[PDB]
């Protein structure tokens, strides 16, 4: 029981998860630049990158298990190589995770229309809550950074780096 | 002491390592397809993918350490999604690793011309021998698979999967 | 296989490493002054001093191993006894390490011209990367200190001392 | 109690054992070639090489203990550098070990004629049975390889490599 | 990327390392003669012999890894069977190691001309420093033995044997 | 309670301790020369060098604790780079330690005149007895070396190196 | 299967082994004399005495096992009570062990003539090699002692006692 629009949509989500992994990887190595040097922001985003790779692998295994055929696409480069500040990176990540969430919600609605409860359950089990938690955590971080005066307050990002992300 | 052609070439190698990671990832999930089902070929290529990601990260850290600026590019999709057979995948990997090697050798020669012994040493230390070992190992595997009659001999790939890659 | 210009240059590097050790020692005891009292800056620079002594000893052992004759020179005093601030000391260290690096690069180029691959390898193995890492780390520290408002912001150096150098 | 023909014959056996060591070393590195890649054949022959070196050292110690003078000779190269197949190498080894055995039997007969029971006992204790066991084991291996269809059956040597020599 | 002059030169070095192994083996069993009986000189040279065999095996593995073909030659006998004294053996070893070093330096220069950085790095990593250390250690031993009055001073070699080589 | 002549004198002693450290370092690497090769003399003098660095650091901490200002000077090179023999080095060290002792005694007398019991106690606690013990130990060593016939007796320094300094 | 000449010859060897035990016992207590005082020579010879007693007991058990009748004889006193020097004792022991060896070889030849392979094997297993090793070891010791200048060099025997026999 597996539709072609479903196979295709899963393949599209695979690519999106790999893109998310790459964005986070880009931010991780931005924050270990010599003129940024926020080593816990770096570690934070590196860990998120690795999570996103696992998100992609889970969908690839789903595709294999349902007898679909994985069709990989180019992984697009992140839209910035200078992420400007710890606050700006967090805000960009929050938007990324909200766009990923809405793609997952779209995929869920497609699965519901197709009467594919196995795909709905897979998404609900592995993706939808983790996305909500991600979105909440990034939102938390953005709020704290703004309240502390980032990015122009000289100490906000340094102190956020050593305590919250430490 | 860091040239712009050098920075650029390192960025090009970063992208190539990420491409290699993606090729191996593609082969890993080909071999767990229901009409392939060579689970040790899958594990083998998955491990190689993860190594290639580390190869890319080491160059990104080098770029940061030398004060260069990482400039990421799209990661191109692998040229096949059906890798046809365990032998064909191994042959395709051997070619990939030889092309990666020749790009690394080109980068080494650029570094030598630029009088950048730190970059030469980095490459020699982390890349050139691992590439030779990789190339040798894949060559070993290709030879064994051909000698056993792959891919048309029904038992060659199954038995290679359970013993050599087990 | 060992040239006299090579022996001489190694002796010059020995002296430079011992000078670097002395500079760091001077900064270590500046920061435990009663009107400075940044005890983790002190510990940081003391550790760097001890590393530099080991850098000098490794070259002395190289000289002995190659059958050269160690010729020691006066170790010059550091150019300041009041290092003014945690930021100023870090900036002065970064410059010192860049000058040491360029002396090591000069020695490497001399060894290459002399066809002395043992000396090239020794330098590449023990010196060139450690210098790049040092330079990067000091650069990181300088950037963080400036961003936090050092030296005139009353809390920047205190907080850098307790977190980054803690 | 030690004859000159005896001293000379022991010296000749020393050289023969060292030759055997070298043959096995040659076969070990043949089987780790990229177009052979039988890593357990390689390990097997490498272990035999090391045994043969010990066989030579025991006779050198005997020579020293009896007050004879060790007179070393050139160690001849093995007669092939391409050993052609796992079966052909095993057959060549069996012949080598039979020729070594017959040289040891000749030495034993010389010792018996000379009334040198210490040399007879040394040979019987350390050499003659190990040779018979070697010859039997190689014969076992040759028989199994032929029965399985080596070298032209694509799987015989691979499977012998992974099970018998694993 | 592997030249025929390179393959040939590596094969020549293999043979030279095996020759060095044999020289040391010859000296080891000289010093356990009943009219020499310097059992720590014996152990010392025996250990050096085993190291040299490993030096040869590393180059054989390099040859296999680069896709070259190992071509073994006769291993020549050492030029003496009576090494005359502990001092004379040490002096002969120092010369051997200097000749081996110069052959390795020649091979390095060949690799540099051929633009083969993998071979340069292999040599620098595994051979050139060990040779310098060897040469220094043997030189140390020769100097101590001469200063103590060897070989004609009845106690020099005995005492060197029990303390330095003990 | 801290005089300017006192601050100055402590600074002069700091420099003298650092000079002593450097002399010992010079002797340590003399005795690991290939034409000296007395590795326990080397270790002995290396340990003394490290002690002298600690002697200097203790006075720097004293200066900081009393609110004085450390003023570092050039560290002069040792007066010899060829220390000639194990006996000559020991004799030169004994003289160095006696000159350091007399400088410490001078500093103590200055402190007594200034009514600075904290400085007197510091010196008595950390310096004066260690100096007497040092002087006695070096004197012991010199006496033994002369009695054994150093430096011209071929075995005196070798045997002193392996037993007393072992 | 046991001849009377064989029984008799074994009885003669028993007595010879007991004589050897007594000689060594005599030398052991010579070297603990107050005007000799070489306590490791003493321990060495005492251990050899105990070995010789075991050599005699093994032949007595052989005699009992073969159904022969042990016929003991007087144990003659050693031919000296003043063994003169550590070198002279070692030389006297070497001669004793060579005479014991030749008696054992004579017994072996008798057994061979009598077609008594059990007695030949007993001798070869327990006696002939131990004798060769003994003879070699004593020869080693004699050579070292002469080379060091014994007995007239005041330090040769003392130093041999503390190192070789320690
Ligand atoms: Cl899967
Ligand atoms: Cl695409
Ligand atoms: Cl950008
Ligand atoms: Cl911003
Ligand atoms: Cl923003
Ligand atoms: Cl900020
Ligand atoms: Cl980094
Ligand atoms: Cl791009
Ligand atoms: Cl395809
Ligand atoms: Cl295929
Ligand atoms: Cl194909
Ligand atoms: Cl197949
Ligand atoms: Cl199995
Ligand atoms: Cl050294
Ligand atoms: Cl100077
Ligand atoms: Cl100043
Ligand atoms: Cl400042
Ligand atoms: Cl400044
Ligand atoms: Cl501040
Ligand atoms: Cl031996
Ligand atoms: Cl020959
Ligand atoms: Cl051939
Ligand atoms: Cl064949
Ligand atoms: Cl054949
Ligand atoms: Cl086969
Ligand atoms: Cl290999
Ligand atoms: Cl040849
Ligand atoms: Cl000779
Ligand atoms: Cl000589
Ligand atoms: Cl000579
Ligand atoms: Cl001697
Ligand atoms: Cl302090
Ligand atoms: Cl000054
Ligand atoms: Cl001098
Ligand atoms: Cl002198
Ligand atoms: Cl003097
Ligand atoms: Cl001396
Ligand atoms: Cl019994
Ligand atoms: Cl009687
Ligand atoms: Cl007597
Ligand atoms: Cl005598
Ligand atoms: Cl005598
Ligand atoms: Cl004596
Ligand atoms: Cl001693
Ligand atoms: Fe996680
Ligand atoms: Fe995700
Ligand atoms: Fe996400
Ligand atoms: Fe791995
Ligand atoms: Fe790679
Ligand atoms: Fe690769
Ligand atoms: Fe460190
Ligand atoms: Fe340094
Ligand atoms: Fe440094
Ligand atoms: Fe805190
Ligand atoms: Fe074995
Ligand atoms: Fe053998
Ligand atoms: Fe054999
Ligand atoms: Fe199996
Ligand atoms: Fe070793
Ligand atoms: Fe070697
Ligand atoms: Fe060597
Ligand atoms: Fe100490
Ligand atoms: Fe001192
Ligand atoms: Fe001192
Ligand atoms: Fe001793
Ligand atoms: Fe015993
Ligand atoms: Fe006996
Ligand atoms: Fe005996
Ligand atoms: Mg994709
Ligand atoms: Mg996360
Ligand atoms: Mg793009
Ligand atoms: Mg873009
Ligand atoms: Mg539902
Ligand atoms: Mg549900
Ligand atoms: Mg979830
Ligand atoms: Mg996330
Ligand atoms: Mg937060
Ligand atoms: Mg890229
Ligand atoms: Mg791999
Ligand atoms: Mg594309
Ligand atoms: Mg394509
Ligand atoms: Mg290198
Ligand atoms: Mg590598
Ligand atoms: Mg690989
Ligand atoms: Mg294989
Ligand atoms: Mg200097
Ligand atoms: Mg450091
Ligand atoms: Mg100055
Ligand atoms: Mg100045
Ligand atoms: Mg380094
Ligand atoms: Mg540093
Ligand atoms: Mg920092
Ligand atoms: Mg020979
Ligand atoms: Mg064997
Ligand atoms: Mg030949
Ligand atoms: Mg031939
Ligand atoms: Mg046997
Ligand atoms: Mg064998
Ligand atoms: Mg078999
Ligand atoms: Mg050869
Ligand atoms: Mg060695
Ligand atoms: Mg020859
Ligand atoms: Mg010759
Ligand atoms: Mg190089
Ligand atoms: Mg290099
Ligand atoms: Mg090396
Ligand atoms: Mg060596
Ligand atoms: Mg020495
Ligand atoms: Mg000073
Ligand atoms: Mg001391
Ligand atoms: Mg001066
Ligand atoms: Mg001077
Ligand atoms: Mg007191
Ligand atoms: Mg004291
Ligand atoms: Mg001292
Ligand atoms: Mg003393
Ligand atoms: Mg009796
Ligand atoms: Mg014994
Ligand atoms: Mg009597
Ligand atoms: Mg008598
Ligand atoms: Mg037997
Ligand atoms: Mg025996
Ligand atoms: Mg005995
Ligand atoms: Mg001895």
Swiss-Prot record, chains A, B, C, D, E, F, G:
The keyword DNA damage does not apply. Detected in testis and erythroleukemia. Expression is very low or not detectable in brain, colon, heart, kidney, liver, lung, muscle, placental, spleen and small intestine. Keywords: Iron, Iron storage, Metal-binding, Mitochondrion, Oxidoreductase, Transit peptide. One of its GO terms (biological process) is intracellular iron ion homeostasis. The gene is FTMT. Its EC number is 1.16.3.1. Catalyzes the oxidation of ferrous iron(II) to ferric iron(III) and stores iron in a soluble, non-toxic, readily available form. Important for iron homeostasis. Iron is taken up in the ferrous form and deposited as ferric hydroxides after oxidation. Residues 1-149 form the Ferritin-like diiron domain. Fe cation 2 binds at residues 52, 97, 131. It comes from Homo sapiens. Fe cation 1 binds at residues 17, 52, 55. It is found in: Mitochondrion. This is Ferritin, mitochondrial. Belongs to the ferritin family. The lineage of its organism: Eukaryota, Metazoa, Chordata, Craniata, Vertebrata. One of its GO terms (molecular function) is ferroxidase activity. GO terms for cellular component: cytoplasm; mitochondrial matrix; mitochondrion; nucleus. Homooligomer of 24 subunits. The functional molecule is roughly spherical and contains a central cavity into which the polymeric mineral iron core is deposited. It catalyses: 4 Fe(2+) + O2 + 4 H(+) = 4 Fe(3+) + 2 H2O.
